[PDB]
Symmetry: C2
């Protein structure tokens, strides 16, 4: 199946077509049907093999545009690094032209990201430390999140973000969809699935 | 996604609709994109109903009709029990009305099933003991199998069919697609996958 064969808005299909993207990776092809109907998934795939569209397309398809100044984000993607936050935010911005995506990360000051959040956001792609700082400031409000993504859960564990990831998910409605991507499934990741996910389907394309 | 949202022949859609089947289960939804493209898959789902279409629809889609007398089957589905062989044959018959499906199973005589195989078959749904007997007799020919399915591998193990299953798979072309369904993945199922499957994707829906 090409992206064309899935039930995606014409505007999302136009965005993919323009960027030369026609064929899902295996993990994407298997994930899309479940993710597009709002189901929780664990995706186990290696390295930097392609998996961003397994969550970016569902976010794009699920969220209608909003004009409201000051609005809270309806999607949250957590990433282990600034590098990945910027890369994922760029990919999500491209397949979701109708959504305001804001990347949140440390290693820089607080002002610009604060100013972007106060203006309003639809999706936030964040590293966990900075995201938690903003939640504590009451600047990041997660109460309207409908889709939470953990991108490279095992890497977030190895960096020591376990507590921050848990706190952030705890600040989102449990009625949300949760998607967890990790090449390995350490005990902490299994605890997350149990505590923070709803009957997750596991898709493993490691081989 | 409903069945009609997948790239299926219209007459396959009409057969599903006539059976009142509209919506894939989670295992079916996740498996179908890969299975329809001919890829090998392990589907970990409960014993019993809820997975048949993950293999029946790929068979139905892949195999063009033939009227050739004496033709050899292009799909083989192995089941642990005689009751399941009959059930799956009936279900596959219903969604693939263009194919001649032959159930092969013990607990009855040899004559009727032999005659049916010799007349020609597109798909065989079999218990492993009876299938191996017909293979040894030269009645069942597996040299043209394009799709092999192990339906409830753990139950096949529990019933003591490991050697027969392996002998049957070894008689099919390795160019084939292989689909394995089981509620659990004991060592034998893992070794079966290692020997008889090509980079299979794992989809685990167990709750």
């Amino acid at each position: 199946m090409e992206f064309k064969d899935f039930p995606l808005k014409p505007e999302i299909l136009e965005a993919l077509h323009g960027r030369g993207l026609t064929t899902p990776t295996p993990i994407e092809a298997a994930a899309l049907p479940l993710a597009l109907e709002g189901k929780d998934l664990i995706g186990q795939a290696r390295t930097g093999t392609g998996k961003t569209l397994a969550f970016a397309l569902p976010i794009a398809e699920r969220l209608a545009p909003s004009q409201e100044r000051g609005r809270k984000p309806r999607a949250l993607v957590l990433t282990p690094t600034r590098e990945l936050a910027l890369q994922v935010a760029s990919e999500l911005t491209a397949v979701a032209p109708h959504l305001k995506v804001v990347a949140v990360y440390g290693g820089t000051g607080y002002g610009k990201q604060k100013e972007a959040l106060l203006r309003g956001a639809d999706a936030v792609v964040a590293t966990p430390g900075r995201a938690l700082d903003y939640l504590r400031q009451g600047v990041l409000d997660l109460s309207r999140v409908e889709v939470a993504v953990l991108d490279e859960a095992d890497e977030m564990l190895s960096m020591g973000f376990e507590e921050e990831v848990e706190a952030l998910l705890s600040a989102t409605p449990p009625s949300r969809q949760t998607l967890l991507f990790s090449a390995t499934l350490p005990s902490w990741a299994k605890r997350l699935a149990e505590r923070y996910m709803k009957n997750p389907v596991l898709i493993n394309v490691i081989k």
